[PDB]
Amino acid sequence: EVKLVESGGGLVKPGGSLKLSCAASGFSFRNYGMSWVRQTPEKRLEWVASISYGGLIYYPDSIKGRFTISRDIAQNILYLQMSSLRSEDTAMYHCIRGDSFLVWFTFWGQGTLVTVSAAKTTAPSVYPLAPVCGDTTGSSVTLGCLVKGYFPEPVTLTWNSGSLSSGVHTFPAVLQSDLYTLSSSVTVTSSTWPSQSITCNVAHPASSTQVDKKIEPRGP
Amino acid sequence: DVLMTQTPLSLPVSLGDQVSIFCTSSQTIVHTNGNTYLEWYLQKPGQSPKLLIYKVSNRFSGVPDRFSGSGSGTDFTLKISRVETEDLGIYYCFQGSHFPLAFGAGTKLELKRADAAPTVSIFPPSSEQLTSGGASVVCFLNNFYPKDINVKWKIDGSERQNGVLNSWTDQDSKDSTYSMSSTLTLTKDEYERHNSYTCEATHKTSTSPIVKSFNRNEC
Numbered sequence: 001e002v003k004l005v006e007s008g009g010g011l012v013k014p015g016g017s018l019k020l021s022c023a024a025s026g027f028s029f030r031n032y033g034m035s036w037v038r039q040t041p042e043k044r045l046e047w048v049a050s051i052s053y054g055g056l057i058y059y060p061d062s063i064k065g066r067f068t069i070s071r072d073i074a075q076n077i078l079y080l081q082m083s084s085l086r087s088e089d090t091a092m093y094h095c096i097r098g099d100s101f102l103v104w105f106t107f108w109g110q111g112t113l114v115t116v117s118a119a120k121t122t123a124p125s126v127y128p129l130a131p132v133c134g135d136t137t138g139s140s141v142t143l144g145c146l147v148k149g150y151f152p153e154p155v156t157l158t159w160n161s162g163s164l165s166s167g168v169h170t171f172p173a174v175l176q177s178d179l180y181t182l183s184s185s186v187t188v189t190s191s192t193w194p195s196q197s198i199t200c201n202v203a204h205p206a207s208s209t210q211v212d213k214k215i216e217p218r219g220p
Numbered sequence: 221d222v223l224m225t226q227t228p229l230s231l232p233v234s235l236g237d238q239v240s241i242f243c244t245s246s247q248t249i250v251h252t253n254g255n256t257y258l259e260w261y262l263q264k265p266g267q268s269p270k271l272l273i274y275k276v277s278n279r280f281s282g283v284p285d286r287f288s289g290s291g292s293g294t295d296f297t298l299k300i301s302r303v304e305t306e307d308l309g310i311y312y313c314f315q316g317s318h319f320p321l322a323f324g325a326g327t328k329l330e331l332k333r334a335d336a337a338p339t340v341s342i343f344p345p346s347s348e349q350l351t352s353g354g355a356s357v358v359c360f361l362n363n364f365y366p367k368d369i370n371v372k373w374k375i376d377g378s379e380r381q382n383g384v385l386n387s388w389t390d391q392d393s394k395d396s397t398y399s400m401s402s403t404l405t406l407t408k409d410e411y412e413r414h415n416s417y418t419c420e421a422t423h424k425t426s427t428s429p430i431v432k433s434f435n436r437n438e439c
């Protein structure tokens with residue numbers, strides 16, 4: 001069974017270096033061409049580098065000079081030396097086996113994540129989002145939760161510990177300034193809240209954070 | 221270099237539908253050995269990309285008979301004869317006939333459904349954040365369809381294009397709609413320098429924007 005497993009990905013400061021590895025199984029590097037391909041946060045796929053079964057190496061000019069691909073045929077391990085790293089280099093890296101002059105990327109590994117950033121482990125700021133008096137005059141009510149400035153990703157947000165599951169929209173985290181910010185919204189019947197308790201539970205494993213924020217109606 | 225251009229970036233479909241996704245190369249892509257290394261990949265949410273078609277029209281072993289590839293010159297096409305729920309995700313084309321090898325931006329296969337006006341909710345800074353000296357004004361434009369939407373902020377009547385962070389959810393797996401959050405981040409002092417905060421959503425369902433707002437002192 002062909003298998004490709006990427007390792008080495010992780011947090012790295014800009015201009016820094018990182019070595020990524022890729023242990024292969026089910027085949028020999030002397031019989032297949034290998035490549036590294038990355039998917040950026042924006043989901044854009046980018047060819048990083050490749051090495052033919054014969055050892056020939058190719059890089060696009062953007063990676064040329066900064067990254068270096070090599071392989072251990074005996075131990076069947078593909079490598080990717082990364083240096084002069086930049087935030088654009090932040091992506092999921094996949095090693096891929098292809099069939100010589102047939103298919104470039106026939107088989108992909110699940111990938112290893114490389115995050116280039118100067119940020120330091122920062123716990124998030126969790127704030128309860130209560131409705132304005134003009135939005136609470138209907139049959140339903142939407143509540144929210146703002147999880148601001150944390151690092152690194154990710155955080156785990158739930159409502160009433162997961163008790164509150166339907167009508168929820170937890171939005172993808174975005175960079176506010178080398179730090180992540182996320183928000184979640186939950187919509188329930190007006191008779192559900194404030195009549196019944198609703199709490200936002202946010203955890204941030206990297207900072208050993210686990211905070212709870214109960215949404216309280218506004219007003220003096 | 222050869223650039224690959226995919227269209228559309230979003231293809232709303234109904235199950236059972238016959239579909240065609242396109243990929244355009246900035247120039248001809250024939251390897252000196254005569255082969256055309258045009259490949260098609262499908263990446264399912266949460267998974268790595270998987271090969272569908274190689275060398276323009278060769279369906280990869282194990283890939284369903286409903287997928288097929290074709291094209292010539294600078295025009296290439298991926299076809300799905302009868303779309304299934306499992307086919308949903310993003311399709312990518314790739315050219316490897318000339319270096320540097322290049323990928324297309326991708327086409328997202330999404331589900332069609334009835335138009336849906338967004339439910340707009342505005343939330344003034346929390347007292348907790350205010351206390352720490354911050355002022356985030358959030359707005360949610362939820363469960364709308366189609367996915368295309370514009371959000372405009374106004375502070376004391378004047379538009380605020382600066383200092384806004386937006387995020388979008390993927391199509392809801394339950395009602396197939398879309399949601400988006402918009403956060404205007406200010407400072408405690410800045411926020412206290414104005415009274416009216418408005419969030420306006422422009423959806424193909426409204427033209428005349430859905431408007432939601434509050435006053436720092438009154439509701």
Ligand SMILES: C[C@]12OO[C@](CCC(=O)O)(c3ccccc31)c1ccccc12
Pocket residue numbers: 032033034035050051052053056058097098099100101102103104105257316
């Ligand atoms: C899988 C593959 O085998 O041989 C090539 C070219 C070999 C060459 O240009 O010298 C190649 C060309 C076209 C499709 C697949 C490949 C190659 C180079 C590098 C990594 C992988 C490959």
